[PDB]
Request: fold
Amino acid sequence: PPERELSRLRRLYQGHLQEESGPPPESMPKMP
Amino acid sequence: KAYRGGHLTIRLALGGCTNRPFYRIVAAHNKCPRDGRFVEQLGSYDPLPNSHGEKLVALNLDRIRHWIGCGAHLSKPMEKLLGLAGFFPLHPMMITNAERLRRKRAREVLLASQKTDAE
Amino acid sequence: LLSSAYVDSHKWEAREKEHYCLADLASLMDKTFERKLPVSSLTISRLIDNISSREEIDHAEYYLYKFRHSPNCWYLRNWTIHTWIRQCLKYDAQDKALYTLVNKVQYGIFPDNFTFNLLMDSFIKKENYKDALSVVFEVMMQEAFEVPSTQLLSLYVLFHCLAKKTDFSWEEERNFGASLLLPGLKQKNSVGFSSQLYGYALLGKVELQQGLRAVYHNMPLIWKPGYLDRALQVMEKVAASPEDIKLCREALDVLGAVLKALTSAEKLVEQLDIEETEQSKLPQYLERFKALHSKLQALGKIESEGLLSLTTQLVKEKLSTCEAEDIATYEQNLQQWHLDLVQLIQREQQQREQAKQEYQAQ
Amino acid sequence: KKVRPRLIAELARRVRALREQLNRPRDSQLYAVDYETLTRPFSGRRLPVRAWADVRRESRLLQLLGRLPLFGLGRLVTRKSWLWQHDEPCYWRLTRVRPDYTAQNLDHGKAWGILTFKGKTESEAREIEHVMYHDWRLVPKHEEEAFTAFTPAPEDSLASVPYPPLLRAMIIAERQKNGDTSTEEPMLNVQRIRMEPWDYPAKQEDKGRAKGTPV
Reply:
């Protein structure tokens, strides 16, 4: 999502935030 | 038993015995008991894999389309079944839960490698 | 500052009245309130219209409060509000008119621009600029600077009180800043642009010291940050305007002192984290100020005369012309108020006549 | 077979309906709040945690209009939640106000107006919801022009989406069974499906009201 929309959500939920997650892996990982 | 308001819903009614669940897909008034009176049975769902390693799901698509066309709602587990069948789109939470599982296993794979590297 | 023709009360005292006894109307309203029934705007109109002593001023105030807290509080007419102020000035009760105006929420006293001038002018004649300033702060809270006459009288009272004032509380800088900005935006002259600069400077100081919410909360101001930036945009506009428009040195010194005091030296964040805060933009403002300050001095667009002195000249020039237009609208309101009042007296008569005829048959 | 009439049931039914109209609680009672505990003294129920900060900082609508002539008819009022959520102007244009005369400060009541949500104005006025919320701000007169200024962006929205995989295969299999040999892809028309934001003002006329039971 754009950076302005993430800033809008960080203000709306200021004080009750988690760490921002990035794009997920392209495939399902596997335990070696 | 006329209820105050309410509506029809396509949902899963639990059957079977202890540790052996079996679901019947039914259209029923949302206020009725889970396993009680229903309007029509629209299929079934066996969540336990059979001898062929399969989860069997029966869908009366003709009657499912009829009751949706008559104003029937869908429970969340029912929406996910229709998404898996390709009848509906994949539910937003099936997609999101899959991404969460990928991030979860990407951290475990990273922790495992860091441990082997230290070894 | 207002002529005698503007303050004259002959045409108001010549209004068509219905003689009543305050005690009678006061009793009729008491019975209606006990029955939890709505009172008519014509009843409160007669009660206020038939005041005849400083002692009745206190009784009428009690029923303006009771009518404000009644089902028909919205129907309080303008001629009743105008009359209430006229009565308070006639029986030397300016402290009562000012009390109800400050407590407009409890009494519903929302005067028009003409009535604001009569009350504010009375305090100016007696040189009671403390109370005249309280009227200006009420004109600002109601955003009633739509008439040029009210704009000039307000700027005159503000500059007269700012010259003597030295120590400012943040609640006073806010009220002074807003009272200087609104009439300044309406005046397209040197006194007008210097008021915008002066106003933005005081508001910009409150923004950085007390926060942006302390500026707009319960104020006729916008909730967008950058009041010091809008002060500099005035200096930019003056530098690209006809030579007739200039800026006073007293206003520029106020902004310079604010910028130097800020640069030299509940927890809810309202601004997006990607935007630049105002505290981080102070060095940029101080640089823009010194650049524009020298640009305006080379163009000869700085005025040496004081704001109070420059405003006094503007009043003598344009106030006489504004009184003529306000007196014209005042006469039009008296006639329209007379027609509207007659229709209320007739509608009441027909209702009593219709009731008598039907009640007798019952 | 003729059911015996139940007169006490009808009697009580009318007495209850009557007492609910003559003893109805007013807005100043239902929508009062204790700003220290953040509870409504009418029912003793606390407000949700996400509303605590605004309840202490923002104003109710009638707290703004009670200070204006004619209770602010014709003025523009916006909400702090709209200012934070949307960049396009969202506001009500007030047309009618019914103040709660029983409030000491006349800071409760109802209001009607014309809605302009995200730059699009409605055709008719209606009752405003969330009038009792601590969330309202008055647009200054000298800021109305700059606040309402809006340029409609081109509604370059998608017109059709595919069918789900199984539904598509069944629609195509039905074509071929009936002799149709078209190769056009089945498509769902989503133009008629106008998606409103979840914070779009709902119909206040069709909204209920808390029943009388003061604590």
